[PDB]
Ligand binder design. Structure first.
Ligand code: NDP
Ligand code: TOP
Length: 165
């Protein structure tokens, strides 16, 4: 139905960990620079817990917060309460980025077209995971080594996948 391309933005470890105590388990500013680069001028779709961990709006992108809380408001952000209400707010967007966390990944699971996933080669302690996925009809179309250095102390790779509709 939806006219906008539903994309997933995620970084996860060797065991699909994406979260530790409502926080990222690693510090990788270069990966965030890639995220900022890839997502510029596009909607970011965030579960309320994800947004509040980030703490403030992110520049040059539509910020959309998913919550059941009907009284919930945030400055320079937009609040949706259902997948459909998002599709409404995004009815004229070309591409949209589901940005997390896990509950919000689960929610949009059946709608994903494209998949921007950063794979990190390390086993972090974590409580929050990226959902298991049926990769039938999916094709890896891109992969490249991330920048490892003093400020980015881990080995990671940028993967992009596309569902053959
Ligand atoms: N490594 C990565 O790429 C990423 C990691 N993370 C990490 O993941 C963790 C957060 O994930 P998680 O705990 O799942 O939190 P979420 O970001 O998914 O927040 C879930 C919230 O969204 C709202 N919500 C959930 N389902 C619905 C629904 N069906 N309808 C309306 N609103 C709904 C609820 O908000 P409310 O209770 O207010 O109504 C719920 O508390 C953190 O550790 C974070 O740092 C997050 C993004 C990316
Ligand atoms: C850009 O800053 C943040 C980003 C994220 C989520 C995230 C991080 N990386 C990737 N590849 N995908 C994602 N969805 C989660 C955060 O929570 C701590 C952030 O705050 C610093």
């Amino acid at each position: 139905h939806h006219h906008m391309r539903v994309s997933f933005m995620v970084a996860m470890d060797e065991n699909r960990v994406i979260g530790k105590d409502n926080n990222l388990p690693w510090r990788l500013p270069s990966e965030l620079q890639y995220v900022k680069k890839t997502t510029m001028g596009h909607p970011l779709i965030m579960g309320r817990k994800n947004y509040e961990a980030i703490g403030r709006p992110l520049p040059g992108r539509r910020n959309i917060i998913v919550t059941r809380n009907e009284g919930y408001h945030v400055e320079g952000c937009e609040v949706a309460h259902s997948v459909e209400e998002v599709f409404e707010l995004c009815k004229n967007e070309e591409e949209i980025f589901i940005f997390g966390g896990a509950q919000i990944f689960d929610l949009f699971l059946p709608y994903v077209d494209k998949l921007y996933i950063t794979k990190i080669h390390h086993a972090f302690e974590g409580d929050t995971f990226f959902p298991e996925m049926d990769m039938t009809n999916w094709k890896e179309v891109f992969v490249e080594k991330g920048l490892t250095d003093e400020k980015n102390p881990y080995t990671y790779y940028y993967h992009v996948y596309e569902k053959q509709q």
